[PDB]
């Protein structure tokens, strides 16, 4: 079981840095970032001190397709709890069974607008993190940390 974190066009340096820290906290295997908008130099200040996750490990790609090659499963995320989208909808309780023995890309979208409908169409599953139904939209890095933690919660 191998985990690739894919962050699509992150906008905030704090988010990018905080995600990089989480990659070390949770021993993520691969860290890909599509066309980052955030200033990488600024992001480094929020990453795990001495870790070089941004500097060395992080792989930048130009487009979505180059970040989702060579995996078994693509799990997109959304703050909207949804047809085709219901059909691919999952929850955190589902993850353990689905990712067993697989190389999985966990894909997160833009702070402004999320993932596009086509990015979701290209993904196998669409994960929603349960939260207040009246305000379920989590900040990007906090969503990432919750998902990564779910890979660790029985330690």
- State how far Cα 87 lies from the chain centre: 21
Asked whether position 128 contacts ligand MTA by CB under 6 A, the answer is: yes
Q: Indicate the residue among 101 and 113 with the shorter CB distance to ligand MTA.
A: 113
In terms of CB distance, is 35 or 81 closer to its own copies?
81
User: What is the C-alpha to C-alpha distance for residues 8 and 34, in angstroms, rounded to an integer?
Assistant: 5
Tell which one of 32, 75, 78, 106 touches ligand MTA (CB under 6 A).
78
Q: Is 17 in the site for ligand MTA (CB under 6 A)?
A: no
Instruction: Kindly tell me which residue out of 13, 71, 115, 120 binds ligand MTA, with binding defined by CB under 6 A.
Output: 115
Report how far apart, in Å, the C-alpha atoms of 118 and of each of 12, 19, 93, 96, 123 are: 23, 24, 25, 26, 9
Q: Does 40 bind ligand MTA (CB under 6 A)?
A: no
Is 85 an interacting residue with respect to ligand MTA (CB under 6 A)? no
Near ligand MTA by CB under 6 A: residue from 5, 19, 99, 143: 143
Answer yes or no whether residue 131 interacts with ligand MTA by CB under 6 A. Answer: yes
Closest residue to ligand MTA, Cβ-based?
109
Which entry of its own copies, ligand MTA, none binds 118, CB below 5 to 8 A by partner kind? Answer: none
Please state the residue numbers annotated as binding site for S-adenosyl-L-methionine: 77-79, 109, 129, 136-138
């Amino acid at each position: 079981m191998t985990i690739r974190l894919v962050i699509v066009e992150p906008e905030g340096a704090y988010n990018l840095g905080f995600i990089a820290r989480l990659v070390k906290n949770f021993l993520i295997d691969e860290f890909y970032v599509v066309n980052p908008k955030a200033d990488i130099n600024e992001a480094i200040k929020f990453s795990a001190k001495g870790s070089e996750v941004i500097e060395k490990m992080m792989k930048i790609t130009n487009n979505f397709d180059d970040a989702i090659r060579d995996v078994d499963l693509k799990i997109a995320t959304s703050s909207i709890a949804d047809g085709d989208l219901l059909r691919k909808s999952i929850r955190p309780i589902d993850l353990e069974r689905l990712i067993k023995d697989k190389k999985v890309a966990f894909i997160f979208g833009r702070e402004s607008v999320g993932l596009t409908r086509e990015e979701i169409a290209k993904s196998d599953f669409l994960l929603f993190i349960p939260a207040n139904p009246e305000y379920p939209v989590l900040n990007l890095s906090h969503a990432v940390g919750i998902v990564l933690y779910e890979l660790w919660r029985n330690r």
